[PDB]
């Protein structure tokens, strides 16, 4: 379809060898990064609430609500800018390189990104090709060349491509002799094994030689040349069209399995907050309809609240209620998760078990956002040569047994022929003796609709009737290519459906002769089939870098080939016997900590802002915050935001020395259990109960007219302080009951939170500075605890609140 002129001479519209893998342009990084960030539902609600606080009314200071929204936007943006500059600087080293070309009867040396379609390139021994050449000649006769495609298929066996026959005579000898030629090729395709072209070399006067081309004459990019002095090609594909840059697909934005449940929780609390605000406003304007409940001769708007329009004050009051019940959704659950992840990614790096003495290095964490997804994996799309076999690895069999025991389903997407990738798999225990292979290789599917009947015979009458451990499939790049690319022929009986059912119903699967992209197609179908089974992929070489970018958490291994598939991996382990300890002892703990941190960061604020709403019924719906103006600001900062951080950062749900010895445990947190609809309603019905107990059990306590032996009344700030003491004590004792790994830091931080709450209540009230425009809470906390019935009421409430947990323990224990 495309006509290229070998000598480029008569008798343009194509890219010039510029691989561009980056995403953000240097100039428009911000106008794109901020628009990609502020599209989310959380990072935009935070901005709406910040603007409302700055415009209409704020109980707290605007800074304590818009300062976190800056540390969260400046840190994620810096992360993304750096992981983009890395690919910028890594593509700069692939372009702007040295590649010699025969410009005009001489050997000019340009930069790889300046090569245009249709010019005789040159390549010395052991040089990655600059572009998809077409072997034209060679210093030696026979027109042969020994290419080793280590960066495409991933195997290192010496292939051999034959140069054009009639052109073997051109070896630096007048190769610029207006060489008549015109290669009519086909549009660029990712097949990597099919290429149909033709040469039309013209002689002195005119020639009609038409030497049809094939895959034997095609020299892809990224295939080092072995055992040869020099060659001569003619770039046919170059830049974003070569067969090595066609099998990339690009990198998607990876979001953990938790960062979606946090988003569902936030989208439910948005509705809870809106319901609270709307119901409070409606009840406020149904209450102020009584002539004498607004301005009853003892408090009267000056003139502005009398003249202000009716329909604008309704909106201003709705906004005041929203801003006042702002705390339901915590912006302190992101500035905390940042630190949690940044500090938790170090325990995967330092761990002394990830140390290989040969290479003398350890693990590596390239992204700190997928830690919480090491304990959710369901599949493992391995790679045969280099990862499994280096003669299997040290423990390449016991690790696969541990990965079959924990519930995972290990596949093998290799790149070698079916003859050898089958024997190894038969040694790794992936194929036991009594495993009836369902071989769908191209050696048995020599037809178009034949495999159509193969799939029916296999599914509708062989396997779909069920013995779940007997069958193990096998495929090739010639059969799966049809199965997938031609999956738009039948829709009443979908091919891809029949095939995916067979694959997901077998014990283990294999795939021989797999091009780089077909791996990403398999790991893109598996990510979509029937929900979202979290997939994993563990490659070693620069050909796996596609499924490592398409999987959910792509683990990369640091092997003999190089660091081209480790620097694009979300992690790094220099072995395969590590993939057990990595995703059994570091996935379980990380997911447990993150799930409990989220559940608690939502419960600790619902229980905090429920009373501050219930109170609106005993006020005149006037938006009077029950608590003081310093407690609303300090709760999430110092009072109860210290403990959960230390818990999330160091707490073993189950001692790790037992997590890796019994891989059965990984099945308790497999289906995202710890954040499903069950526990989310157990934590939203514990907060919505403690937040009513606190309030009403203090309200009933204030029906006595006095609480001191000397008979003195208590204001409306002692209401707030009693409820806040009860609240802090309860939401710290809940975590002190939930924590089951008590280090020297957990005792310290937990008990220190309570001791500091007490000392701060004492020190904030008791000294007039004065720099406060108001003396509301001067001596409230001392005169409050100077009574004998207050201690008793509080010790009764901190137990009526913790009753549900102590009961669930005693019941979720026996039977």
């Amino acid at each position: 379809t495309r006509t290229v002129f070998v000598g480029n001479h008569p008798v343009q519209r194509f890219c010039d060898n510029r691989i561009v893998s980056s995403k953000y342009t240097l100039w428009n990084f911000l106008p794109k990064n901020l628009f990609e960030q502020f599209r989310r539902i959380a990072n935009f609600y935070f901005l709406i609430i910040f603007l409302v606080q700055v415009t209409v009314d704020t109980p707290t200071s605007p800074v304590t609500s818009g300062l976190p929204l800056f540390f969260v936007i400046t840190v994620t943006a810096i992360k993304q800018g750096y992981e983009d500059w890395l690919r910028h600087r890594a593509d700069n080293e692939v372009n702007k390189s040295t590649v010699y070309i025969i410009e005009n009867a001489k050997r000019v040396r340009k930069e790889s990104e300046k090569i245009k379609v249709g010019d005789v390139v040159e390549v010395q021994a052991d040089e990655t090709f600059p572009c998809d050449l077409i072997l034209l000649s060679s210093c030696t006769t026979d027109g042969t060349c020994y290419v080793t495609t280590a960066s495409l298929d991933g195997e290192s066996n010496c292939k051999t491509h034959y140069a054009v026959r009639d052109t073997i005579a051109l070896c630096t000898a007048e190769s610029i002799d207006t060489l008549r030629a015109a290669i009519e090729c086909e549009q660029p395709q990712p097949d990597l094994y099919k290429f149909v072209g033709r040469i039309n070399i013209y002689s002195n006067s005119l020639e009609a030689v038409a030497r049809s081309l094939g895959p034997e004459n095609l020299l892809l990019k990224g295939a080092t040349l072995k055992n040869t002095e020099k060659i001569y090609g003619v770039a046919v594909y170059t830049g974003m069209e070569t067969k090595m840059a066609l099998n990339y697909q690009g990198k998607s934005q990876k979001r953990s399995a938790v960062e979606k449940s946090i988003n569902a929780f936030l989208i439910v609390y948005l509705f809870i907050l809106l319901t609270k605000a709307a119901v409070c406003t409606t009840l406020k304007y149904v209450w102020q309809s009584t002539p004498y409940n607004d301005e009853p001769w003892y408090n009267q708007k000056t003139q502005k609240e009398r003249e202000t329009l009716k329909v604008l004050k309704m909106f201003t009051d709705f906004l005041s209620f929203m801003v006042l019940f702002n705390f339901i959704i915590p912006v302190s659950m992101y500035v905390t998760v940042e630190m949690q992840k940044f500090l938790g990614s170090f325990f995967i790096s330092w761990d002394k078990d990830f140390y290989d003495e040969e290479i003398n290095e350890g693990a590596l964490v390239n992204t700190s956002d997928l830690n919480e997804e090491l304990g959710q994996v369901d599949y493992v799309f391995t790679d045969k040569t280099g990862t499994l076999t280096e003669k299997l690895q040290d423990q390449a069999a016991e690790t696969i047994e541990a990965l079959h025991a924990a519930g995972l389903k290990v596949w093998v997407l290799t790149g070698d022929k079916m003859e050898t990738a089958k024997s190894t798999c038969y040694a790794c225990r992936l194929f036991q003796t009594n495993t009836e292979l369902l071989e769908l290789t191209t050696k048995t599917i020599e037809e178009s609709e034949r495999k159509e009947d193969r799939l029916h015979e296999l599914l509708i009458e062989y396997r779909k009737k069920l013995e779940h451990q007997e069958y193990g499939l096998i495929i090739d790049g010639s059969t799966l290519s049809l199965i997938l690319n031609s999956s738009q022929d039948s829709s009443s009986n979908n091919y891809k459906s029949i095939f995916l059912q067979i694959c997901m119903k077998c014990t283990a699967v294999l795939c021989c002769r797999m091009a780089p992209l077909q791996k990403a197609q398999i790991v893109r179908m598996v990510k979509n089939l029937k929900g979202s089974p979290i997939t994993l992929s563990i490659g070693d070489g620069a050909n796996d870098v596609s499924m490592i970018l398409e999987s959910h958490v792509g683990i990369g291994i640091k092997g003999k080939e190089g660091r081209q598939a480790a620097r694009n991996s979300d992690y790094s382990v220099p072995k395969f016997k590590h993939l057990k300890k990595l995703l059994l002892a570091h996935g379980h703990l990380y997911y447990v900590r993150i799930a409990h941190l989220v559940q608690y960061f939502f419960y600790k604020n619902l229980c905090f802002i429920l009373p501050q709403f219930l109170y609106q019924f005993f006020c005149g719906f006037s938006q009077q915050p029950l608590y003081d103006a310093a407690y609303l600001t300090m709760y999430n900062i110092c009072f109860t935001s210290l403990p959960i951080l230390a818990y999330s950062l160091l707490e073993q749900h189950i001692n790790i020395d037992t997590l890796t010895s019994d891989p059965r445990l990984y099945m308790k947190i497999s289906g995202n259990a710890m954040l499903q609809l069950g526990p989310f309603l157990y934590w939203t019905f514990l907060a919505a109960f403690e937040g009513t107990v606190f309030f009403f059990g203090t309200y009933f306590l204030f029906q006595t007219a006095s609480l001191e032996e000397n008979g003195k009344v208590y204001g409306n700030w002692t209401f707030g302080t009693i409820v806040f003491t009860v609240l802090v004590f309860t939401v710290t004792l809940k975590l002190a009951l939930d924590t089951r790994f008590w280090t020297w830091i957990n005792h310290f931080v937990i008990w220190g939170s309570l001791a500091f709450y007490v000392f701060f209540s004492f020190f904030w009230g008791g000294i007039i500075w004065p720099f406060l425009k108001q003396q509301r809470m001067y001596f409230v906390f001392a005169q409050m605890l100077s009574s004998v019935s207050t201690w008793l009421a509080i010790i009764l409430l901190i137990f009526i609140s913790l009753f549900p947990e102590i009961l669930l323990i005693v019941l979720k224990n026996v039977r």
Partner: protein, 324 residues
């Protein structure tokens, strides 16, 4: 080479507690055994405390002074007979409650300038702009600004004991000792300028609803301005639509006779504060005090219920837990 610090290797020393059925069950019995006695204690103490509430808001011709539910702009009086069945022995405290008086409103709980009431020479002549619209009257600043101090409760309640004969006997009511010590001694101080009070408030003006400036509340040199016990106990907000502010302290006699012997009394009230507009009700609560505070049954019932529902649940789980 490998950094083996016992912290980084995730192998710190831990407690790893094991709490379950056989180790928490005795807790559901200790709770009951330590919550039933305290429950009965604070339900008998809150039961042996006497009090009385004499509403005198009027609202019905059948009241002693419904005559003043709609009177002329002059001082009013009542006489609300009340009788005590069993006299009071300890110290007796006289409160004055209200109803449907939202002293916790937002537009109301902030209507005050704390710097001023704390005695800031500057603020005394330039109160803040939050205590509006009671900030300045007659192009001058009000001494106590804000809607809180403006609407102070200005009723006068007085008890008279009717002895064997019709001669009414007055009772000793002391005003000192009703406001928090912390605040009256420190939070509320008179302006520093000079010693005599009338010259400290030079650019000031009594509140609008008030009838006498702040330097004439009481002649007593220690109860004269910005620290008047009643004024303070009113400047503390209510926290609910129905509150009860300490009014006077009746001291127990030296003799063993009851502070308020049983019989009939007179409640001579100088009606001034009108609370019929907003469907409110005033009343006088005469009550004694005990170690834990006034008469309130809640705490007792709550402790008893918690102790019992802990003991019963513990026994139930113990029976079933033993049953396996």
């Amino acid at each position: 080479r490998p950094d083996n610090t016992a912290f980084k290797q995730q192998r710190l020393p831990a407690w790893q507690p094991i709490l379950t059925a056989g180790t928490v069950l005795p807790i559901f019995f200790i709770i009951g055994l330590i919550f039933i006695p305290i429950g009965i204690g604070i339900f008998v103490t809150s039961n042996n405390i006497r009090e009385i509430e004499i509403d005198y808001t009027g609202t019905e011709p059948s009241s002693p002074c419904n005559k003043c539910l709609s009177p002329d702009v002059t001082p009013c009086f009542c006489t609300i007979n009340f009788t005590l069945e069993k006299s009071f022995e300890g110290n007796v405290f006289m409160y004055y409650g209200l109803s449907n008086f939202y002293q916790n409103h937002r537009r109301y709980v902030k209507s005050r300038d704390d710097s001023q009431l704390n005695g800031d020479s500057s603020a005394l002549l330039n109160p803040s702009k939050e205590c509006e619209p009671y900030r300045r009257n007659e192009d001058k600043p009000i001494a106590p600004c804000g809607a809180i101090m403006n609407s102070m409760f200005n009723d006068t309640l007085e008890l008279f004991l009717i002895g064997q004969d019709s001669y009414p006997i007055p009772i000793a009511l002391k005003k000192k000792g009703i406001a928090w010590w912390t605040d009256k001694n420190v939070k509320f101080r008179n302006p520093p300028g000079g010693d005599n009070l009338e010259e400290r408030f030079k650019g000031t003006t009594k509140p609008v609803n008030w009838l006498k400036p702040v330097y004439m509340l009481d002649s007593d040199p220690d109860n004269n301005g910005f620290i008047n016990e009643d004024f303070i106990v009113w400047m503390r907000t209510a926290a609910l639509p129905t509150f009860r502010k300490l009014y006077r302290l009746i001291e127990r006699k030296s003799d063993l006779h009851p502070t308020l012997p049983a019989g009939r009394y007179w409640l001579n009230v100088t009606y001034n504060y009108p609370v019929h507009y907003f469907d409110g009700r005033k009343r006088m609560i005469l009550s004694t005090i005990s170690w834990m505070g006034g008469k309130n049954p809640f705490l007792g019932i709550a402790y008893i219920a918690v102790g019992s529902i802990s003991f019963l649940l513990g026994v139930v789980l113990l029976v079933i837990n033993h049953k396996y």
